[PDB]
Amino acid sequence: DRIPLQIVRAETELSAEEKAFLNAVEKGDYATVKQALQEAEIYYNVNINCMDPLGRSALLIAIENENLEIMELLLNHSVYVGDALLYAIRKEVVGAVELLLSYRRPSGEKQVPT
Amino acid sequence: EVKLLLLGAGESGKSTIVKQMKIIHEDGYSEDECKQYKVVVYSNTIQSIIAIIRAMGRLKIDFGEAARADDARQLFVLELAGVIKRLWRDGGVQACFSRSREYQLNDSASYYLNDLDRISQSNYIPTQQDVLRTRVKTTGIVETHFTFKDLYFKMFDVGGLRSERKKWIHCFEGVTAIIFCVALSDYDLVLAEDEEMNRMHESMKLFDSICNNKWFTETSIILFLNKKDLFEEKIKRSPLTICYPEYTGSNTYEEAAAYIQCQFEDLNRRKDTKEIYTHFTCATDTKNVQFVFDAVTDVIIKNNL
Amino acid sequence: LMMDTQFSEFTPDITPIMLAAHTNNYEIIKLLVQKRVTIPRPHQIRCNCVECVSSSEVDSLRHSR
Ligand SMILES: Nc1nc2c(ncn2[C@@H]2O[C@H](COP(=O)(O)OP(=O)(O)OP(=O)(O)O)[C@@H](O)[C@H]2O)c(=O)[nH]1
Ligand SMILES: [Zn+2]
């Protein structure tokens, strides 16, 4: 007799621009990400540290897809770098762990963004 | 404690609101402090007449009288008071002034230029209104502390331009209230940093960012639709359709102002969750800003109960 | 259309939400639940109402499936 099915533990739904940004990240297109990061700096459209509902971040998705140039551009534009080294280690790839180990000290100015 | 951010695009009126928090809530600028703005009044005046003259080339506008050509040369090298007067009163110069939306001209240009006799006297001391009218770019943060209704206001003035955006992210922590300033008189203007960009569309997209940002879910969002005085004058000669091609209302202050308010308030993507507290303002009008800021403070108190 | 609903690999009692639950995939289940879908409630094991008895008597295999 029509058992009601509904999302009882509802996460905050992603914004359309955020969905476009992470879809571009998982797509692997290098050119599309850069305009998004510049417009997120200037126009503050996209929060870079947003979180899709299945436990992933743009840096972290770039870790799973093992692309290093998207890694370098994202971490140049100040993604939250913490806890990402463990996913790279579990990925068992030398390039990603070397890249996050090397760029822990990019002459950090004004501490970290809040 | 109330953390208050003054945000908005370049030239929207942020620092002018900051000047008002001095005089409205405090003794305010001293004669000596006024005297410190004299060189700024002069620079704003000189740079404004230079800007109009320079534009006359781009705009294909001749001097009303040939004799002004040498005054223009003299102006660039620099008696100065006489030269500026003759240029300002020239018919070619005035024709260019009338078309200032086609270049970049300070809002206070005619204010000063029409008062040239007064401001050019050797004994000139800027008045408090002269100070309010000055244009000084605001680069970096301008945190100042003020106390209203016994609230300890921690106020952050920041650069409105797109070059100044980098500073904004550091100040986003613990914001009780944002006063977001919009120059009403910018529907037909283009950005100084991008002359293919209309100023009002730039102000919308930022307000789209600032209103819907997850940092400001609990922050009280106050919208100052500012430069109401300039807008009242401009609307009688420059149609709103320049900015909003779909507008079918009148080019009158009340209707056009109301439409702009609607366009900004529509950018709120959480209308059944969040208010925008909108006021029409003249930031250079002390009485007006005092009344509006009193009302704003009441909203903040009521929202922090 | 005539004569083309002949073959279906899935039994007619299978609704999309039931098959999504059978495959046990989070994204498809979430997408289906977001679109206001329902599943019928099974009766008690010791049920003796008219509809359960009639459905078991007419076609027991369909009821059990
Ligand atoms: N008459 C009048 N002048 C105004 C009004 N708002 C701003 N102005 C003037 O226009 C200019 C803009 O004010 P500012 O304080 O420079 O604006 P701002 O947003 O702080 O500018 P930034 O430094 O770029 O952030 C100044 O010269 C002000 O005196 C207004 O409502 N009326
Ligand atoms: Zn039954």
In this complex, is the C-beta atom of A54 within 8 Å of any C-beta atom belonging to chain C? yes
**Radius of gyration of chain B, Cα coordinates, nearest whole angstrom:** 20
Is A1–C40 a contact, with Cβ atoms under 8 angstroms apart?
A: yes
Give the ranges where B99-159 is alpha helix by DSSP (H): 109-114, 116-119, 128-133
CB half-sphere exposure, C59, CA atoms < 13 A = 3
- Bridge-based pairing of strands B151-158 and B2-8 is parallel
Cα distances (Å, whole numbers) of residue B67 to B30, B86, C60 = 42, 10, 109
Residue to mutate among C28, C39, C51, with most A CBs inside 10 A, is C39
Nearest to B253 by CA among B280, B275, B232, B277: B232
**Helix, strand, coil share of chain B (percent; to 5):** 50, 15, 35
Q: Using the structure block, give the residue that is written with the tokens 């006799």.
A: B117
Which amino acid makes up residue A35?
Q
Query: What DSSP designation does B237 have?
Result: T
Is B170–A110 a contact, with Cβ atoms under 8 angstroms apart?
A: yes
Element (H, E) at B244: none
Element (H, E) at B148: strand B141-148
Element (H, E) at B56: helix B38-59
Cα distances (Å, whole numbers) of residue C12 to A5, C63, C64 = 21, 12, 13
Q: Which ligand is nearest to the CA of C43?
A: 2
Give the ranges where chain C is alpha helix by DSSP (H): 16-23, 26-33, 50-58, 60-64
Asked whether the beta carbons of B135 and B106 are under 8 A apart, the reply is yes
* SS3 letters across chain A: CCEECCCCCCCCCCCHHHHHHHHHHHHCCHHHHHHHHHHHHHCCCCCCCCCECCCECHHHHHHHCCCHHHHHHHHHCCCCCCCHHHHHHHHCCHHHHHHHHHCCCCCCCCCCCC
d(CA C65, CA C63): 6
**Torsional sign, CA B125, B128, B134, B136:** positive
Asked whether the beta carbons of B34 and B127 are under 8 A apart, the reply is yes
Q: Is B175 helix (H, G, I), strand (E, B) or coil?
A: coil
d(CA B125, CA B37): 9
Q: Min CA distance, A19 vs chain C (Å)? A: 15
Element (H, E) at B159: none
d(CA A114, CA B37): 37
Is C37–A54 a contact, with Cβ atoms under 8 angstroms apart?
A: no
What is the interface size between A and B, counted as CB pairs within 8 Å?
28
Is B168–A114 a contact, with Cβ atoms under 8 angstroms apart?
A: no
Chains with ≥3 CB–CB distances under 8 Å to A: B, C
Nearest to C34 by CA among B297, A11, B264, B271: A11
Q: How was this structure determined?
A: cryo-EM
Q: Which ligand is nearest to the CA of C55?
A: 2
In this complex, is the C-beta atom of B170 within 8 Å of any C-beta atom belonging to chain A? yes
Which pairs count as long-range contacts for B118-127, CB under 8 Å and 24+ apart, including other chains? B119/B41, B119/B42, B119/B45, B120/B81, B124/B38, B125/B31, B125/B34, B125/B35, B125/B38, B126/B34, B126/B35, B126/B37, B126/B38, B126/B41, B127/B34
Q: Report which protein residue has its CA nearest ligand 1's atom 10.
A: B107
Asked whether the beta carbons of B135 and B108 are under 8 A apart, the reply is yes
